[PDB]
Amino acid sequence: YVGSKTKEGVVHGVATVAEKTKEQVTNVGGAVVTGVTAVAQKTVEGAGSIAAATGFVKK
Amino acid sequence: YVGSKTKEGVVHGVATVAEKTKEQVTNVGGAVVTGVTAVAQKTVEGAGSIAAATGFVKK
Amino acid sequence: YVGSKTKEGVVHGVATVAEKTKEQVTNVGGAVVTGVTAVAQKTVEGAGSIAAATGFVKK
Amino acid sequence: YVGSKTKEGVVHGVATVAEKTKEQVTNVGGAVVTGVTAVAQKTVEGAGSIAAATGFVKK
Amino acid sequence: YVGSKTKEGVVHGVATVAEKTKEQVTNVGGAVVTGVTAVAQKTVEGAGSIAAATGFVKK
Amino acid sequence: YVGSKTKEGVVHGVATVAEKTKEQVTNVGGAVVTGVTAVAQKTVEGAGSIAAATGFVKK
Amino acid sequence: YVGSKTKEGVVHGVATVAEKTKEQVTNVGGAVVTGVTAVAQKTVEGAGSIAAATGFVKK
Amino acid sequence: YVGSKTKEGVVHGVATVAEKTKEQVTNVGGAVVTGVTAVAQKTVEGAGSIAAATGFVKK
Amino acid sequence: YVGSKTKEGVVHGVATVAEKTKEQVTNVGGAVVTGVTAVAQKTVEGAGSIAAATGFVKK
Amino acid sequence: YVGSKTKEGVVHGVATVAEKTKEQVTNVGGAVVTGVTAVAQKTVEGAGSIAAATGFVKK
């Protein structure tokens, strides 16, 4: 017998509740990111980014 | 016998509830990202990005 | 016997409820992304992006 | 015996409920994306993008 | 017998509740990131970043 | 103006998911009740009972 | 103006997920009740009972 | 203006997750009640009982 | 202006997670009650009881 | 202006997590009650009891 269970980058038992949650954003140049719940990813090469915000990259 | 279970980049047991949740965004140049729940991905090459916001890339 | 179960980039047990959830967006140049629930993807080459917002790329 | 189950980029058990959910968008140049629920894809080459918004690419 | 369970970059038993939680952001150039709950990822090469904010990278 | 909204005995926003849920019952005299999800009733006189089990009423 | 909202015996925002949940019952005289999720009722006279189990009422 | 909101016997924002939860009951005379989640009721006269178990009432 | 909000016997913001929770009951005469989560009721006359267990009432 | 908020017998912000919690009961006459989480009730007359266990009331 051989058994090799293996999980990587996983999110499984999640329960969320929200009520009467007002929210307001006002962007005037640049970036905004809000409310990123229960995500998972796996990337082998390249950059792996979750909810990343940059302002204007000017050159 | 051989058994090799393997999961990568997974989101499975998820339950969410929201009620009377007002929300308001006002973009005037740039970027906004909001409300990204329960996502998963797997990318082998290239950049893997989830809910990423940049302002104007000017050159 | 050999058995090799393998899942990658999966989202399966998901239940969501929302009620009386007002929402308002006002874009005046740039980009907005909102409400991206329960998605999954797998990309082998190239960039893999989920709910990504850039303002005007000007050159 | 050999059995090789394999799923990639899958979304299967999903149940969503929404009620009296008003929503309003006002684009005046640029892009808006809203409400992208329960999607899955697999792309082998090329970029794979789900709910991506750019403003005017001007050159 | 051999069994090699192995999990890396995992978030599984999570329950969150929020109520009457007002929030307000006002970006005027630069970047804002807010509300990043219960995420996990695994990246083998490249930089792995979760909820990272830079202002305008100017050159 | 008069407005009198009134609800009694109501169940409305409900989403359930179940998978690979084996179940087995073996009654040999008496009663069994199982799996009673999302029900509502209103009774003005008489007894109101939901998922009630008695063994043999012998006299 | 008059407005009299009134709810009694209500269950509305509910989301449940269950997976690989084996279950087994073995009654040999008497009663069993199992799995009674998200129910509501209103009874004005008479007894109101939800998921009540008695063994044999013998006389 | 008059407004009289009034709720009695209510259960509304509920999210539950369960996985690989084995369960086994063995009644041999008497009563068993198990798993009574998220219920609400309102009874004006008569006894109001939720998940009540008696053995054999013998006389 | 008059406003009289009033709630009685209410359970609203609830999130529960359980995993690999084995359970076993063995009744041989008498009563068992188990697992009564997130319930609410209101009774005006009569006895109000939640998850009450008596053995055999013999006379 | 008059405002008279009033809550009685309420349980609202609750989040519970349990994992690999084995449990075993063995009743051989009498009563057992176990696991009564997050309940609320209001009773005006009559006795109000939550998770009460008596053995055989014999006369």
- Find all residues with CB under 8 Å of G11, minimum gap 6, and list them: F10, F11, F14, F40, G38, G39, G40, H10, H11, H12, H14, H38, H39, H40
What is the Cα–Cα distance from C39 to I54, expressed in whole angstroms?
Answer: 50
8 Å CB contact between J12 and E18: no
What is the Cα–Cα distance from I17 to A15, expressed in whole angstroms?
Answer: 7
- Tokens standing for residue H46: 């008569």
- Find all residues with CB under 8 Å of C34, minimum gap 6, and list them: B25, B32, B33, B34, B35, C23, C25, D33, D34, D35
Decide the pairing of beta strands C2-3 and B2-3. Answer: parallel
What is the Cα–Cα distance from J14 to E18, expressed in whole angstroms?
Answer: 10
What is the Cα–Cα distance from J52 to H49, expressed in whole angstroms?
Answer: 12
Q: Between chains, do H31 and F48 touch, taking CB under 8 Å as contact? A: no
What is the Cα–Cα distance from E40 to F51, expressed in whole angstroms?
Answer: 42
With 0-12 / 13-18 / 19 or more C-beta atoms within 10 angstroms meaning exposed / middle / buried, residue H17 is buried
- Neighbouring chains of H at 3+ CB pairs under 8 Å are A, B, F, G, I, J
Question: Chain I 1-59, CB below 8 Å of chain H: which residues?
Answer: 1-59
8 Å CB contact between B56 and B34: no
Nearest CA to B51 out of I25, H6, G40, A52 is that of A52
Number of separate helices (H) and strands (E) present in chain B: 0, 8
Residue A48, beta-bridge partner list: B48, E48
- Tell me the shortest Cα–Cα distance from D41 to chain C, in angstroms: 5
**3-state percent breakdown (helix, strand, coil) of chain C, nearest 5:** 0, 60, 40
Angle, CA of C25, C28 and C31, to the nearest 5°: 70
- CB count in 10 Å sphere of residue G6: 15
What is the Cα–Cα distance from H39 to G51, expressed in whole angstroms?
Answer: 10
- What is residue G40's DSSP assignment? E
Number of separate helices (H) and strands (E) present in chain I: 0, 8
- Chain F CB contacts of H4 below 8 Å: none
Nearest CA to B46 out of C51, C39, A48, C41 is that of A48
- Tokens standing for residue J9: 């017998």
The CA distances from residue J11 to F18, G34, I39, J37, J42, in Å, are 28, 24, 10, 10, 12
What is the Cα–Cα distance from J59 to I56, expressed in whole angstroms?
Answer: 11
Position H15, amino acid: A
Nearest CA to I58 out of C5, J29, D47, E45 is that of J29
Nearest CA in chain I to A18: I13
- CB count in 10 Å sphere of residue C58: 15
Strand order in the sheet with F31-37: F31-37, G31-37, H31-37, I31-37, J31-37
Experimental method: cryo-EM
- Tell me the shortest Cα–Cα distance from B8 to chain A, in angstroms: 5
Nearest CA in chain D to F14: D17
Q: Which residues of A13-32 are buried (b: 16+ CB within 10 A; e: fewer)?
A: bbbbbbbebebebbbebbbb
Residue whose entry in the numeric block shows the structure tokens 């995500």: A39
- Tokens standing for residue I53: 């267990």
8 Å CB contact between H44 and I45: yes
Q: Which residues of B20-33 are buried (b: 16+ CB within 10 A; e: fewer)?
A: bbbbbbbbbbbbbb
What is the Cα–Cα distance from A15 to E41, expressed in whole angstroms?
Answer: 19
8 Å CB contact between H3 and I2: yes
Of H19, H29, H45, the CB nearest to G19: H19
Is chain B adjacent to chain E, meaning 3+ CB pairs within 8 angstroms?
A: yes
8 Å CB contact between F50 and F36: yes
What is the Cα–Cα distance from C28 to I43, expressed in whole angstroms?
Answer: 55
- Chain A CB contacts of I17 below 8 Å: 13-15
Task: Give the CB-side neighbour count of residue I41, counting CA atoms within 13 A.
Answer: 36
8 Å CB contact between H20 and I19: yes
- Tokens standing for residue B47: 């950049």
Nearest CA to D11 out of I16, A47, G20, C36 is that of C36
- Chain D CB contacts of C44 below 8 Å: 43-45
- CB count in 10 Å sphere of residue F12: 18
Is chain D adjacent to chain F, meaning 3+ CB pairs within 8 angstroms?
A: yes
The CA distances from residue C28 to D27, D30, D53, E16, E24, in Å, are 6, 7, 14, 35, 19
Torsion angle, alpha carbons of J35, J37, J40, J43, to 10: 10
- Chain F CB contacts of H23 below 8 Å: none
8 Å CB contact between B13 and C13: yes
**Sheet strands (E) in chain J:** 2-3, 7-11, 14-19, 24-27, 31-37, 40-43, 48-50, 53-54
